[PDB]
Design a protein around this ligand. Structure first.
Ligand SMILES: CCCCCCCCCCCCC/C=C\[C@H](O)[C@H](N)CO
Ligand SMILES: CCCCCCCCCCCCC/C=C\[C@H](O)[C@H](N)CO
Ligand SMILES: [Cl-]
Ligand SMILES: [Cl-]
Ligand SMILES: [Cl-]
Ligand SMILES: [Cl-]
Ligand SMILES: [Cl-]
Ligand SMILES: [Cl-]
Ligand SMILES: [Cl-]
Ligand SMILES: [Cl-]
Ligand SMILES: [Cl-]
Ligand SMILES: [Cl-]
Ligand SMILES: [Cl-]
Ligand SMILES: [Cl-]
Ligand SMILES: [Cl-]
Ligand SMILES: [Cl-]
Ligand SMILES: [Cl-]
Ligand SMILES: [K+]
Ligand SMILES: [K+]
Ligand SMILES: [K+]
Lengths: 282, 295, 242, 49, 242, 49, 99, 295, 48, 64
């Protein structure tokens, strides 16, 4: 008491259908905007022209981020060939990174942060699309859990990790996954480094790598002591569900080159829009 | 059964969904029907007043007087605020220096030329080594704060040009990939965290990150059109997936100043047209005290 | 067991099927959410935000792209000249592709509603002049002269007056919704043409540039909606991402 | 194993069996075996008229 | 029969699926339960129990392991010397592995909460002295001198006074949860460093040992929780169990 | 799982079966209908002409 | 020295802030820890060899042959529970046949 | 249907689970949601008082006076008690000798040396041949009892060292397996049931059983740190999967005394530092009378 | 950049022709004697 | 908060030591930094002097 110096405006609204149009006539300066402020023109039809009444029942439900994202998309293709350089071992460990396929990636990168649960579907077959009576095991190996070093590895005992056993002939396996980041949300962009220290050019592959997005390894194998005679192709589809998103940003307008960064082909910088001869001719 | 655990990713929002479920865990449920909420007034009109040019803002022992102002933008319609107890995680009592840190710091000045490409700065990188703010940022592991950005640029009624001043959260930079695109190169610490001097964009059209400048206005921004105004102001709230973070390893956002309409003037008129950046952190909070670390 | 009969659809995987799959981690509790500014719930919130239109999308700009972000006006020697022209079709290849609006509606098959284009004059303060901006509904090709274009929906803008101006493109269609317009049968869904003419002239005194530029910003209005979610043609997996 | 995909007007059409369009991140696709029963789905009234 | 359609997931065996399978012995009644002391319901009950920290985990101990269970203090000739140092990361390889807490959290991917370390002085009763124990949050490597370490969270302990003392490692993180820290990107989740310094000196009179030992006990506090159940790397089926 | 037994008819496709198939476009809203003269509900209306 | 764990918490040794902690303890309940199917046995019936070219096999029930699960159970001295057994069978290479 | 038989393994606990089921037997049901109960005060603080050194406990015709005590531990927070009728199974009336058996017996003394490995004793093996208790244990098939363990060790204020005194239920011993691990050897009766003389640990670090000494404190324990106390006391309730059992074939638990911090002292000070064990069974009950059997 | 750390005002002409800087009484003592070189530099007010 | 400065050694012939406040902390931690950036300062202090010795040692320090 003996010292006197020690004593968000915007909100939501539910709009199920597009706004309507009201009538007006031959009649305050609402046509000229001060776009220098960083605001979008609040001028509508009724201001610049004479209008009729239109009872607009067009629905806005399909543009809800949920209907936009909750569509299963390809995020990975894993192959286990029998003859070659890949894995004549009968098993494969895949670091989880969903940024290897553009269609989905570009959609997510529309936002800076995203939080959601997901439905993963596992479509498996031979490289030509044929199916055979082969038993498989998919296992989720969280960060810290021991990764299988072979098709015989004890890790396939899967006493605590979650594993799925399914035949290549059964329908696609399918499961639900919760929001697992240790942060409040996954983030497609992390303008920083994961650790302290000097950031010499040798460790610049560190830039942009966010541990909170690193969900571990996904392992798969044929279930047998002996090698399987079949080459295997596994396509993993992901369907986002129960999603929330923050901070929209410009959409990628240059082809993707790498999973972990926004590097672009500097010699061939594509223009966002097609070109024409003259500004006065279509 | 039907009664379950509360473990769905969308359980803490004022937007409900109708679902169907038979497993004990909520995230197994379907996506459901989408409610139809909307807040188009935080991007299209996050301006001040939801004689505007005339002004004067004071914070700390510093005061700015702006008159050819274009009003003020409140990023995403939210004011900076100390971190609330529900969101907080770290248990130690944070230090809230107030006046010694929440004030106006005026960084180096750049010169606008008829051929300038554009510049950018990172936050809080720009102040990590300035005044009391910087010192606190070094002695503490955790930091959290908001910002007031004031960009200044004068010119006669005979000059012309337009700067787009924008804030881009998590401004991750990319390289031109060896040009051919076969080299997986990366930006050096000096480019990702240029310090208080800021850096120059090499390819403004794609913001040195494979994204269209043409769409940057989807971010809190303001224009400095010489014939209308000579300064821009943007209040920025803290944005991150965590309540507090390192002021050293993570830059919450970058500030970009790009000449979208090039500077021009008849020869004989003043050719030295500077651009100055003054920023003030707001509601600065620090925690996790230890010895000073510069990086 | 209970009498059941499998029906067609059995065993299929529909990418857009919204069902219930078993959870892999029972009893798991996600890190609680915290407040983050800037949450969006519907894409439309974004489409209402003005982004820059590349009206100056010339073949000669491609190597100096920054120049596409604005087109010029200069002292005319002839009256009523045409300054620039472009289609209002938002989902069509052209100037609109550079806007967040155009990119987003390319993720939907159809759209409906009014659009708005705001023009900002970035010339010197001493420059004055009036421009005629018109929107010509479907049917007529590019108006040959200002006197023809003037017969359509238009606005007459003055710089000295206000630095920015907003042209509204009223939803004037036969159908309730338009599919993306392109050459061929789908030209049926064209929205129309926007033309910018010199009402008077770009006047400037001694001491100021005789050429200045205008930035065009575009976005959708409140009555705008889209339907039939599809994949965008604007992104490609030209090669493998490593 | 087969894949049927609906490519609405404007969506990129597959140019090959390897085409990226089969990523089907937004278009609706159905995956079914020639041995499974016939695939079956419901379609809404999609005309713009 | 009733119209049904098989959905993806059909026929699969998810090890963590919590369903209902048919009973093999109908009408069977298990031997009734009796009271047995020591029932536990949640692993956390165990994590709150102090177990011994192998702070003295040297390569030279491996053949005489009992020596790892305690480290020494002795009459110093120099002021402010460093007695011992170690990381507070509980799920990390090191001293913590010897504690029931560390072993258990290795069965979970992430954790959160405060930890406590209790030091017990087992020297003679005639020995006295004060030690400075500090916890340095992330960022700084091992403090070079006591004057640097002193800037962090610390406690100043005196033997003569009490035989045991408890240092609390407050949960001071950016994220609500930490994943197990290890070299590399995951060093991001490091908890920090604990250092033990000589505040004054180990003083003893004629007749008593000039070297004694300290036992470090560690456990979690009430706000400690773990999530994302996984398999431990700390056990192996090196060969076949017969 | 719940005890069930497949009965004859399983897997068959009856062209006149009036069942429920999954929707390909979730949240889709068809262009609203407008008034059009000449709507007919039953073929008999025509046979009387 | 008593055999008790320190009842000293944050508020005692340092100055703290109020934190509304909603972290859930449901996943560390012994039920969620154990109710995860694990391998307890591998039985083989080969056709050519020393094992069982007899076509049948008798296995004495002992679940202690695999560490992952065993170590978890041996965390406790006594345990009482019901169980769900799942039988995954195939040829030694993972192939399946109408047997 | 839905109404069933009460045959689930978790039907007699004050902790309910929500389940789903369609078979007549309860054990077929799912695991269900886990309630969130906790009792962290039976392991972390199973001490006496939930002038403590000063004391005196009397039972039978024996009395102990402890003053450099470190309080008293009640194992798992439970007091010994005669077996209740609900848990009982054997129908004959048990004999409850009281005073002649529930009293303090003081077994052989061991000598603590600077290089001592550590010792252990088995219960009730240690008393099977002592006084009236032993006799009853021999004449009866079934036995049940609790225990009071008092370990004593004096030393001057110039000596130092620390003994960890712990109780380990079902203390099953293992062999070093021929060293190489290819020999499936087993401990002889003399090692598993050493009698009243107890035995010596050969590999204390792993408690001669492949488990870390470092974690033994997860068991009812107490420390004897020479500079603080010179005795430890632990009350132990009966622990078994059965109400009564043979005192001959089954040892309910073992008592371990291990020098975690080795004994040390300056030469000239008393070098003979003994350790003495005094134990008192509590609530001893016997049943199934017949002739005496020694094993 | 150094001076900016003290009490300041940022003035614009086009805006207003005049501007007022306030020199807050920031002293240790309740009163200052006239400052001059030497011991009395103790009562200096500061620099503009 | 508590800052722990250098340690001195007490010898049978020691004369005695002294420190000045706030001189001692002008260059330590955040306190020092604030002292440097500001013209004016005001504060109170908690002084804790420590010295252990066996029950067989003797001597007396006057802390003032
Ligand atoms: C047995 C089923 C196993 C299925 C487990 C799959 C878990 C996948 C969790 C989704 C994580 C979202 C992706 C997060 C981050 C991005 O990939 C990062 N950019 C990679 O650095
Ligand atoms: C037709 C289905 C047959 C399935 C019957 C399986 C019954 C298995 C009961 C589980 C018993 C738990 C294991 C008990 C004891 C340990 O194995 C012992 N250490 C072995 O000596
Ligand atoms: Cl296996
Ligand atoms: Cl959703
Ligand atoms: Cl919906
Ligand atoms: Cl400068
Ligand atoms: Cl410059
Ligand atoms: Cl460029
Ligand atoms: Cl269009
Ligand atoms: Cl594919
Ligand atoms: Cl020192
Ligand atoms: Cl850790
Ligand atoms: Cl649960
Ligand atoms: Cl004796
Ligand atoms: Cl002995
Ligand atoms: Cl040993
Ligand atoms: Cl000294
Ligand atoms: K049946
Ligand atoms: K039927
Ligand atoms: K089942």
């Amino acid at each position: 008491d003996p010292i006197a110096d020690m004593i968000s405006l915007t909100a939501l609204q539910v709009l199920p259908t597009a706004a309507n149009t009201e009538a007006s006539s031959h009649r305050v300066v609402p046509a000229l905007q001060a776009a220098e402020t960083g605001a979008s023109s609040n001028a509508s039809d009724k201001n610049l022209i004479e209008t009729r009444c239109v009872l607009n029942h067009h629905s806005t439900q399909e543009t809800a981020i949920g209907n936009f994202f909750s569509r299963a998309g390809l995020v990975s293709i894993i192959t286990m060939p029998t003859t070659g350089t890949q894995n004549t071992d009968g098993y494969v460990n895949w670091d989880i990174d969903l940024m290897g396929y553009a269609q989905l990636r570009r959609k997510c990168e529309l936002f800076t942060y995203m939080r959601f649960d997901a439905e993963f579907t596992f479509v498996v077959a031979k490289p030509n699309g044929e199916l055979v009576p082969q038993l498989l095991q998919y296992m989720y190996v969280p960060p810290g859990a021991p990764k299988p070093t072979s098709r015989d590895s004890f890790a396939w005992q899967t006493a605590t990790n979650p594993s799925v056993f399914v035949k290549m002939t059964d329908p696609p396996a399918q499961v639900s996954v919760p929001f697992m980041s240790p942060a409040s949300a996954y983030q497609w962009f992390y303008d920083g480094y994961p650790t302290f220290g000097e950031h010499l050019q040798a460790n610049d592959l560190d830039y942009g790598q966010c541990p909170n997005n690193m969900m571990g390894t996904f392992s798969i194998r044929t279930v047998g002591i002996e090698k399987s005679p079949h080459s295997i192709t596994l396509r993993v589809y992901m369907r986002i569900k129960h999603v929330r998103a923050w901070i929209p940003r410009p959409l990628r307008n240059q082809p993707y080159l790498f999973k972990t960064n926004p590097n672009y082909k500097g010699n061939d910088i594509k223009c966002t829009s097609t070109s024409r001869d003259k500004i006065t001719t279509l | 059964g039907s009664h379950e655990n509360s473990n769905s990713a969308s359980e803490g929002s004022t937007i409900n969904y109708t679902t169907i479920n038979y497993y004990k865990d909520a995230y197994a449920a379907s996506a459901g029907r989408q409610d139809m909420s909307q807040d188009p007034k935080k991007f299209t009109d996050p301006v001040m007043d939801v004689s505007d040019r005339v002004a004067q803002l004071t914070i700390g022992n510093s005061t700015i007087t702006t008159q050819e102002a274009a009003n003020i933008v409140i990023a995403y319609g939210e004011w900076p605020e100390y971190c609330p107890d529900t969101d907080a995680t770290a248990v130690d009592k944070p230090t809230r220096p107030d006046v010694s840190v929440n004030r106006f710091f005026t960084l180096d000045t750049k010169s606008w030329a008829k051929d300038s490409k554009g510049w950018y700065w990172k936050f809080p990188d720009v102040l990590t080594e300035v005044g009391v703010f910087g010192q606190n940022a070094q002695f503490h592991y955790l930091y959290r704060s908001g910002f007031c950005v004031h960009v200044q640029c004068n010119a006669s009624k005979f000059h012309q040009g337009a700067l787009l001043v924008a804030v881009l959260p998590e401004y991750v930079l990319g390289t031109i990939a060896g040009g051919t695109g076969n080299e997986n190169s990366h930006p050096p610490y000096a480019t990702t965290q240029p310090g208080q001097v800021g850096a120059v964009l090499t390819h403004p059209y794609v913001l040195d990150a494979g994204i269209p400048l043409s769409q940057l206005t989807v971010c809190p921004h303001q224009w400095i059109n010489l014939r209308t105004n000579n300064c821009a102001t943007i209040i920025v709230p803290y944005m991150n997936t965590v309540p507090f973070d390192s002021a050293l390893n993570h830059c919450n956002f970058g500030l970009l100043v790009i000449p979208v309409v090039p500077l021009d003037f008849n020869t004989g008129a003043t050719s030295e047209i500077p651009i100055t950046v003054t920023i003030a952190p707001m509601c600065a909070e620090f925690a996790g005290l230890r010895q000073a670390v510069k990086q | 067991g209970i009498p059941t009969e499998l029906k067609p659809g059995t065993n299929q995987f529909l990418t857009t099927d919204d069902g219930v799959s078993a959870p892999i981690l029972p009893g798991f509790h996600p890190t609680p959410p915290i407040h983050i500014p800037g949450e969006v719930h519907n894409l439309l919130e974004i489409c209402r935000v003005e982004t820059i239109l590349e009206v100056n999308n010339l073949k000669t700009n491609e190597t100096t792209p920054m120049q596409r972000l604005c087109f010029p006006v200069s002292v005319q020697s002839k009256t009523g000249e045409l300054c620039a022209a472009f289609r209002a079709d938002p989902g069509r290849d052209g100037p609109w592709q550079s806007t967040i609006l155009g990119q987003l509606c390319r993720y939907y098959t159809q759209w409906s509603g009014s659009l708005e284009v705001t023009f900002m004059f970035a010339g010197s303060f001493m420059a004055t002049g009036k421009m005629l901006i018109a929107y010509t509904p479907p049917g007529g090709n590019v108006p040959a002269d200002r006197i023809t274009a003037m017969l359509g929906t238009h606005v007459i803008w003055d710089f000295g007056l206000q630095s920015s101006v907003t042209l509204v493109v009223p939803w004037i269609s036969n159908t309730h919704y338009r599919a993306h317009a392109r050459a061929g049968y789908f030209d049926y869904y064209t929205t129309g043409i926007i033309t910018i003419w010199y009402q008077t002239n770009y006047v400037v005194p001694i001491g100021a540039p005789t050429t200045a530029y205008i930035v065009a910003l575009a976005a959708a209005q409140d009555n705008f909606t889209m339907k039939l979610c599809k994949d965008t043609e604007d992104i490609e997996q030209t090669a493998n991402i490593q």
